Design a protein around this ligand. Structure first.
Ligand SMILES: Nc1ncnc2c1ncn2[C@@H]1O[C@H](COP(=O)(O)OP(=O)(O)O)[C@@H](O)[C@H]1O
Lengths: 260, 39
């Protein structure tokens, strides 16, 4: 990770970076994960220090060395593809990229179900409703949500149980359930990290939500079906009076096609 | 001699196979036939 290398002095920094690559070869097959890529290799034209520019060059040479370091794959994480030195994204090196994005309403429910695997839930807990309301939350936000709900449930009972020892009795933990009041409380304290970002997901608007326009619905289905059965058209313009459902039509066709 | 004449036929045949309107027209029709078959 960036901070681990950048906190080091000149020489020690570059040494630790290239040493990790050598270890991966010795232990191949291996994966080298470089977190905060924008911190380890910031754009050279955006820095003044010699240490930062040298580290960028050192990472670039280490990526090229992968032609000899057989079975070593290097993965990196950044916030934006445009926050790193463009040399890293040239053919070779990091020439494959994946946009992780923000979990959708279904994924958020699945994430909550994963975090509650060890949690006893009360009958009033509805994680699907929570996942629908938690817009702008990412997996690390839902992890904090479950943790806060767990701690609230613990405080309510432990203040009366009075178990003061080095170990916790399995029985009193096993009987402890987290209720809707504990999730609601945690929701009021949680603060989404991805609220200002755009969320892209499959819409829930279907054709039954649009009144009228029977011929428009059929025409839109032909647009998406013809490119598969058969230059096929890849778009359509909605024009006409306002307030007739132009947005709903675009969502409904995405819904039925299971498209984002 | 005759052994070289058989090598001559092989060299000329490979040159013609590498240089090669009829297969371009047939291949363009074949592509349109498959699209009309499934549409
Ligand atoms: N064909 C329709 N059937 C039912 N409701 C509609 C229709 N067209 C518009 N509406 C109502 O108008 C509102 C705005 O529709 P929307 O498509 O979001 O507007 P725009 O496309 O201009 O952004 C919707 O909330 C919906 O309730």
């Amino acid at each position: 990770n960036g901070p681990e290398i950048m906190s080091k002095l000149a020489g020690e920094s570059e040494s630790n970076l290239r040493k990790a690559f050598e270890e991966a070869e010795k232990n191949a097959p291996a994966i080298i994960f470089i977190d905060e890529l924008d911190a380890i290799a910031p754009k050279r034209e955006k820095t003044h220090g010699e240490v930062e520019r040298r580290i960028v060059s050192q990472l670039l040479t280490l990526m090229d060395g992968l032609k000899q370091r057989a079975h070593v794959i290097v993965m990196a994480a950044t916030n934006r593809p445009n926050s790193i030195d463009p040399a890293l994204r040239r053919f070779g090196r990091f020439d494959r990229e994946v946009d992780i994005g923000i979990p959708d309403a279904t994924g958020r429910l699945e994430i909550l179900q994963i975090h509650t695997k060890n949690m006893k839930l009360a009958d009033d807990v509805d994680l699907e409703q929570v996942a629908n309301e938690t817009h702008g939350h990412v997996g690390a936000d839902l992890a904090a949500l479950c943790s806060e709900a767990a701690l609230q449930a613990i405080r309510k009972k432990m203040d009366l149980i009075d178990l003061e020892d080095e170990t916790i009795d399995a029985e009193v933990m096993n009987s402890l359930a987290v209720t809707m009041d504990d999730f609601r409380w945690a929701l009021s304290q949680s603060n989404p990290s991805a609220l200002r970002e755009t969320v892209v997901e499959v819409p829930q608007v279907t054709w039954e939500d649009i009144g009228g326009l029977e011929d428009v619905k059929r025409e839109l289905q032909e647009l998406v079906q013809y490119p598969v059965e058969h230059t096929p058209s890849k778009g359509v313009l909605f024009y006409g009076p306002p307030g007739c459902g132009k947005t709903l039509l675009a969502k409904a066709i995405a819904n039925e096609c299971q498209a984002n | 001699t005759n052994e070289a004449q058989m090598a001559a036929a092989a060299a000329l045949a490979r040159l013609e196979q590498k240089q090669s309107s009829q297969d371009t027209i047939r291949n363009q029709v074949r592509k349109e036939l498959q699209a009309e078959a499934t549409v």
